Symmetry: C3
Subunit: 189 residues, 3 copies
Amino acid sequence: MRLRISEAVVLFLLGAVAALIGDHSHVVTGTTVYHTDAVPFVWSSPFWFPILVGAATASLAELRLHLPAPRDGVTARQALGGVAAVVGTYVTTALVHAFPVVPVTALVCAAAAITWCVLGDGPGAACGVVIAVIGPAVEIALVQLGVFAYHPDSDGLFGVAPFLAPLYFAFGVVAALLGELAVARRPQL
Amino acid sequence: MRLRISEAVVLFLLGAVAALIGDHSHVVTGTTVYHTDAVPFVWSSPFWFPILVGAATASLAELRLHLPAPRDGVTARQALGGVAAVVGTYVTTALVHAFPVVPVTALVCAAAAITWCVLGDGPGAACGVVIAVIGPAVEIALVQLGVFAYHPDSDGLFGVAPFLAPLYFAFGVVAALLGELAVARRPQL
Amino acid sequence: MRLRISEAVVLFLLGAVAALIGDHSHVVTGTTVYHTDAVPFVWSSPFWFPILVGAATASLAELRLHLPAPRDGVTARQALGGVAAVVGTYVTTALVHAFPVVPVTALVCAAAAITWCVLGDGPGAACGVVIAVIGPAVEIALVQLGVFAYHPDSDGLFGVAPFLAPLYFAFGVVAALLGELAVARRPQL
Ligand SMILES: CCCCCCCCCCCCCC(=O)O[C@@H](CO)COC(=O)CCCCCCCCCCCCBr
Ligand SMILES: CCCCCCCCCCCCCC(=O)O[C@@H](CO)COC(=O)CCCCCCCCCCCCBr
Ligand SMILES: CCCCCCCCCCCCCC(=O)O[C@@H](CO)COC(=O)CCCCCCCCCCCCBr
Ligand SMILES: CCCCCCCCO[C@@H]1O[C@H](CO)[C@@H](O)[C@H](O)[C@H]1O
Ligand SMILES: CCCCCCCCO[C@@H]1O[C@H](CO)[C@@H](O)[C@H](O)[C@H]1O
Ligand SMILES: CCCCCCCCO[C@@H]1O[C@H](CO)[C@@H](O)[C@H](O)[C@H]1O
Ligand SMILES: CCCCCCCCCC
Ligand SMILES: CCCCCCCCCC
Ligand SMILES: CCCCCCCCCC
Ligand SMILES: CCCCCCCCCC
Ligand SMILES: CCCCCCCCCC
Ligand SMILES: CCCCCCCCCC
Ligand SMILES: CCCCCCCCCC
Ligand SMILES: CCCCCCCCCC
Ligand SMILES: CCCCCCCCCC
Ligand SMILES: CCCCCCCCCC
Ligand SMILES: CCCCCCCCCC
Ligand SMILES: CCCCCCCCCC
Ligand SMILES: CCCCCCCCCC
Ligand SMILES: CCCCCCCCCC
Ligand SMILES: CCCCCCCCCC
């Protein structure tokens, strides 16, 4: 792998912590409800939820490093900005989930687009597309399995929120950037 | 004209589509209600609404190209970012229209200002001023004519929402940028 | 002092006006209620509130100029952008104050972080930390004294809103930038 172990671990933990904050926001606003109770929870989430997102974070960062021309100019400042953007957008979906689907989804698309405009490149966008498909698909399957459910005003995409698509896209863009940063910030001559 | 026909057509369509999304958001949140019913509607809007905004988009882009020193460094990335900002702000007004007028209007002014800070120049700002006057004036006239109405908590500017002023301003700034892009993206040596 | 008197006065007034807008937003949304009535009010605020914030604005700008390496490239465009960001974030706290504390506080942290990412440096961040401690501490004392109170869904930090911490932080970052601008914009050869 191109990531060092320690790097993948930090990325995993960063993904996990951000996921717990965002998922807690969804639960406490009634954006989503879990139905699973036999599993251990971490905060408001089943233990495997932060593992999945943390794994996805390190995985997408790794993936970027196998795509052409990882950018060596990427900075901690840019990375902090992208994480903030993704977290900000995530918690915003909790706050507006009960509003009509068009302005809500459009708002999140706007945030995702601006995030890419400021920070993303072609391969970054590609990583975003990959998770923008896989993320919602996994959630649809879990909802279909009765593991959790979305609020009725927030379930238009086969039982899950349409905002998940631009939300995951922005996530993929930033995770890619994070992988670029992991290399770029290594000690230099 | 400085725009090519094909360019003006794309700008017109971009304006029209964004307008339909934003106007639908206003209707479905109860920000506005139409009273006209004898005209054909496109989605939630009278057919002439997207024509007006699309026309205004191409027109403002054209106008910029007659103002001093159109910037040749303008990119698709910048343009996508500005459109996202304008659409994001537009749908946000639908979401917050029922809140008190001061924080709502201030929020939209903030978005408009930041949009200009990131993307606009002097002539861009001038295009913004032009539509920030004309836009709301046209709406005031239409409301006065009983064509549509704003929500009572959102009609303080002679029957229309005070947020229309910074919203149109941001629109004018980005449309100007779009005209700069139309020239800048032409095939080069 | 490094600031000229006229500069400190403009900064003071800018701070005062922005504070009045933000504080009015808090009062009118029920984010906060004043209990003091024997003092003259300016708009929705006791007269000393805008004095305190204006004083804090000029003071933090001054403070930055005693910290290492004030940036001479700082522009009016950057400064307008930062003020807009701080005001936008301020009024947003009024709009979302009744929502659950985690997504609300996280949203404001995100705005503060992005603001620093775009505009701040090390000493700027330090100014932010200084007021992110002092601001909320002063408010806690005033609330303890019964001078005003926060909404029950917005008082988790010893009686004041946890969002005050990232809000003041962003304020400190931008005020620092404003002090840099005051020097940088002086007439040049
Ligand atoms: C090969 C590595 C493992 C691959 C696994 C790829 C799939 C990962 C994602 C889909 C999974 C999560 C399914 C899920 O349970 O989420 C649901 C449960 O109800 C949580 O409910 C929700 O409403 C929240 C949707 C989560 C949105 C995730 C966005 C990621 C942002 C956090 C990272 C920020 C750091 Br750049
Ligand atoms: C010479 C070219 C023709 C000039 C025409 C100039 C005037 C254009 C604008 C004012 C017109 C629209 C009047 C109108 O009907 O709007 C109302 C109807 O109730 C729609 O109601 C609303 O609450 C929405 C206000 C519309 C805000 C428009 C912002 C433009 C953003 C979309 C473009 C984004 C791409 Br950069
Ligand atoms: C040495 C110079 C004087 C130092 C004084 C330092 C302390 C300043 C700040 C803490 C003071 C204000 C205490 C206060 O009364 O505020 C309360 C009263 O209830 C107002 O209530 C609220 O809910 C609003 C909290 C105010 C948030 C202030 C953020 C500043 C943004 C405005 C400036 C933007 C320009 Br960069
Ligand atoms: C992208 C966010 C991850 C950044 C932190 C990764 C931590 C592991 O990264 C390690 O950091 C060490 C200390 O700087 C360096 O000496 C190593 O070269 C580097 O591999
Ligand atoms: C600003 C958004 C408009 C961009 C798309 C304009 C489409 C018409 O633009 C045309 O694009 C062609 C294909 O690239 C070029 O060959 C032409 O030079 C150009 O006029
Ligand atoms: C950071 C916001 C403050 C900017 C305005 C400060 C006004 C006082 O600033 C003064 O401006 C004069 C006119 O430009 C200059 O001639 C002086 O050199 C300058 O001190
Ligand atoms: C070059 C400075 C970049 C700052 C990052 C800001 C992130 C914004 C994401 C929406
Ligand atoms: C720029 C905004 C485009 C996204 C709007 C899509 C609406 C989703 C309908 C389900
Ligand atoms: C290569 C250019 C990719 C741009 C994608 C940004 C759009 C995201 C919207 C959800
Ligand atoms: C400031 C260092 C350059 C690295 C670029 C990363 C994001 C830019 C997107 C155009
Ligand atoms: C960009 C979001 C995509 C939304 C698609 C909705 C599909 C609905 C099928 C029932
Ligand atoms: C140089 C990169 C510019 C990115 C555009 C972002 C648009 C933000 C508008 C508020
Ligand atoms: C920077 C914010 C300035 C705009 C606030 C104006 C309030 C409108 C009152 C009708
Ligand atoms: C020439 C400078 C113009 C700056 C204008 C930006 C402010 C818009 C606020 C609604
Ligand atoms: C990156 C290409 C330069 C074009 C500038 C357009 C917006 C900048 C506003 C200062
Ligand atoms: C920036 C928004 C301007 C608002 C003006 C309000 C005028 C009210 C007249 C009845
Ligand atoms: C170099 C152009 C900087 C534009 C300032 C934007 C401010 C955003 C603060 C969140
Ligand atoms: C990036 C977001 C981190 C901030 C969340 C903190 C929550 C506050 C709980 C009182
Ligand atoms: C020296 C780097 C400082 C970065 C601080 C930005 C984080 C603010 C979050 C509330
Ligand atoms: C464009 C002039 C340079 C001044 C920099 C101020 C903010 C930058 C933060 C990295
Ligand atoms: C970043 C915000 C900090 C919040 C701290 C909450 C402390 C609660 C003590 C009762």
